[PDB]
Structures are given as C-alpha cells and as structure tokens.
Structure 1
Amino acid sequence: RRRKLPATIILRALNYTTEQILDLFFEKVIFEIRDNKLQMELVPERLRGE
C-alpha cells in the first residue's frame, strides 16, 4: 500500500522484456509484405462490433 507505478514494472522485475510483456496479455496479428502489397491474417471472430 504505497505510491503507484505502472504494473509492468514488476514484470520487468521478473526478468520480462517489453516484447514478452506484449505476448502475455494480447493476441498477436501478423502482417506479410509480398508482391509489393499488404496482407493480413484475418480472423472473422475478431471483427465483431467494428
């Protein structure tokens, strides 16, 4: 019960880098750049309410 800090500071204290931090809360989305254009790993379920 002290002063506030961003709750990722303890994660780094557990030897977690920022990228690992991002890959522990969120679902990644991979994009590909082929044939001089931009593609996307589309997931139909994710497009709910957009």
Structure 2
Amino acid sequence: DNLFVRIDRRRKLPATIILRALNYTTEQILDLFFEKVIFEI
C-alpha cells in the first residue's frame, strides 16, 4: 500500500516526488495527508 505516479504511461515513479517538485516539504506533506494528535507528559 503505497502510491506511484506514471506520466504519459512511460514508467513507474513514487508519488511523493510530484509533491516534492511543487516546493513542498516532508512535514508539510504529512500535515496535508494526515491528522495530528498531541502527546504531553
């Protein structure tokens, strides 16, 4: 269970690369595609 991107049906490529190309950071990606919880001690 992971996502790929294929442009013009050429060859497989991971789907995170297209997000990276649009000046997106890893933590921004995780904020976009996940929901957060708070842990406190």
Indicate yes or no: 2:34 matched with 1:26: yes
Deviations, residues 29-48 of structure 1 (Å, cap 9, x unaligned): 11112xxxxxxxxxxxxxxx
Deviation (angstroms), 1:6: 1.2
Structure with bigger helix share is 2
Q: Which has the larger radius of gyration?
A: 1
Report percent identity of matched pairs: 100
Structure 2 gap ranges (5+): 1-8
- Aligned residue pairs total 33
Q: 4+ residue runs of structure 1 moved beyond 2 angstroms? A: none
Q: State TM-score, norm by structure 1.
A: 0.59
Report the Cα distance in structure 2 between the residues aligned to 1:30 and 1:2, rounded to whole angstroms.
Answer: 42
Structure with bigger strand share is 1
Structure 1 gap ranges (5+): 34-50
RCO comparison, higher one (Cα < 8 Å, 6+): 2
In the alignment, which residue of structure 2 is the partner of 1:10? 18
